Design a protein around this ligand. Structure first.
Ligand SMILES: *[C@@H]1O[C@H](CO)[C@@H](O)[C@H](O)[C@H]1NC(C)=O
Ligand SMILES: O=c1cc[nH]c(=O)[nH]1
Length: 246
C-alpha cells in the first residue's frame, strides 16, 4: 500500500508519496529507461491501495489498477464506491469486500464522463494539495455530483502526477494555493496513451515516433514530439502504458 497525509504536508512529503506510488507499480522492463507497466496482472495483485488522509485525519482508501494507474473505486468508512465500468466492477470482486455496502457511481472514470457529471471541464477546476483535502472530504459521504469533481482532482493529483514529473511539480507549486491546471498539464494527461505507444514503437524505429505527438509546452506554446530525444521522454514521462492495453 502507499499513503499520503495532508496534515503537515509540504512539497517534499507530496513528492515522497508520488515516488512511493510510482515504486508500487510493477514492471519487468524499461523502455528508453522508463518503466513499462505490465500487460496484465491476475487477481487481487492487480490493485494498489492508496491511503489518503485529509487535514483532520479522516481517510479514504483508493484502489488503483497497476497496469494503467486507473482509479477503480475507493472505500470511505464502511461503504465502497466504484466507477460504472467493467474494469471497476471486476475490481469490486477483489477489493473492499468487507464494506457494509457497495455503491456503483452513476458514471465511468474517464475525463469526458466525469466532466459531464461535475458540470465543468477540468480547465476550470482548481487543483493542488488544498483541493485534494477537499476531495477526500467530499468522498467521505456520498454525493455523486460533488464526487465527480472530487474525483477529477484526485485522479490529477495522484495518477497523473505519478505519470509525469511536470505534473508532480505543478502540484508541488500548489501545495498551499490551488490553481487550475496549466494547458500543458491537460495536454500531457490527454497524451499519455499516445506517448506511451509512440515510445514503445520507437524501439525498432531508431528512436523515431511512427506518428508525432502534438503537445502544449510549459510556456503555453504548441510543440510537436517526434523522437525519444525530446525532454518529454528523457525527463518528464515516468510510466508507460503497455501497447498491449492500447
Ligand atoms: C528529434 O527531437 C529533437 C528534440 O525535440 C529535435 O530537436 C530534432 O529536430 C528531432 N530529430 C529528428 C531526427 O527527428
Ligand atoms: O480513464 C479512466 C477510467 C477509470 N479510471 C481512471 O482513473 N481513468
Amino acid at each position: 500500500d502507499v499513503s499520503f497525509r495532508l496534515s503537515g504536508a509540504d512539497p517534499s512529503s507530496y513528492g515522497m508519496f508520488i515516488k512511493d506510488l510510482r515504486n508500487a507499480l510493477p514492471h519487468t522492463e524499461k523502455v528508453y529507461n522508463i518503466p513499462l507497466l505490465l500487460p496484465s496482472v491476475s487477481g487481487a495483485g492487480r490493485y494498489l491501495l492508496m491511503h489518503l488522509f485529509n487535514y483532520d485525519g479522516n481517510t479514504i482508501t483508493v484502489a488503483v489498477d497497476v497496469t494503467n494507474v486507473y482509479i477503480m473505486g475507493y472505500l470511505a468508512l464502511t461503504t465502497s464506491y466504484f466507477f460504472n465500468e467493467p474494469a471497476a466492477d471486476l475490481a469490486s470482486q477483489y477489493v473492499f469486500r468487507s464494506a457494509r455496502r457497495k455503491i456503483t457511481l452513476p458514471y465511468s472514470g474517464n475525463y469526458e464522463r466525469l466532466q459531464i457529471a461535475a458540470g465543468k471541464p477540468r480547465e476550470k477546476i482548481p487543483i493542488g494539495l488544498p483541493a485534494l483535502d477537499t476531495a477526500i472530504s467530499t468522498l467521505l459521504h456520498y454525493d455523486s455530483t460533488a464526487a465527480a469533481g472530487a474525483l477529477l482532482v484526485l485522479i490529477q493529483t495522484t495518477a497523473e502526477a505519478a505519470r509525469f514529473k511536470y505534473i508532480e511539480q505543478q502540484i508541488q507549486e500548489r501545495a498551499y494555493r490551488d490553481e487550475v491546471p496549466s494547458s500543458a498539464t491537460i495536454s500531457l494527461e490527454n497524451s499519455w496513451s499516445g506517448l506511451s505507444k509512440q515510445i514503445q514503437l520507437a524501439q525498432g524505429n531508431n528512436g523515431v515516433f511512427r506518428t508525432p505527438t502534438v503537445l502544449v509546452d510549459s510556456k503555453g506554446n504548441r510543440v510537436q514530439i517526434t523522437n525519444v530525444t525530446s525532454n518529454v521522454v528523457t525527463s518528464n514521462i515516468q510510466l508507460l502504458l503497455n501497447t498491449k492495453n492500447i
